[PDB]
Amino acid sequence: PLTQEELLREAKITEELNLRSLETYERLEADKKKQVHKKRKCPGPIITYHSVTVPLVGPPARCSRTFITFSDDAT
């Protein structure tokens, strides 16, 4: 008794659900990338030496600049 539009909407919902189900096997990329390339590390005090290319102001003209970052005010 249902119409084609209802079947299509249900098909879209089931497609998303199956894709998440299928991703149990096929989500090899996103999960591994987010688990390996983490942007944070173990707890505790850390001192980060950082040095990046920055463009000079008044390939392009560039200079090197250093930043030092401290995790907590105590250190």
Binding site: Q4, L7, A11, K12, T14, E15, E16, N18, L19, S21, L22, Y25
Partner: protein
Amino acid sequence: DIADVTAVAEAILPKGSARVTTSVKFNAPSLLYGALRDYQKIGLDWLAKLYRKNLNGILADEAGLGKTVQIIAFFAHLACNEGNWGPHLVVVRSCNILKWELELKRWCPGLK
């Protein structure tokens, strides 16, 4: 008489030495995710014509030609062009059940 059914089946048989030169510009069903190869489209069209004539058929394509993908495309065609969303039954070897499920989810995730 069986001769009439055989004549109809012979009239549905794709023509050509390789059965690959079919003028039917059969567009892949919108519900199928991915692109079908030309021979796969021809097989799909043949299956659709068999369904429209209420006839059965035997797909004897060599192993690796994507017969399962052809069946998935046939189901997608039945849902989109014939409105046949009804319960379909597929009997396969136990070693192939997971393969068939994964192929159905990959090519037509919209089907329950």
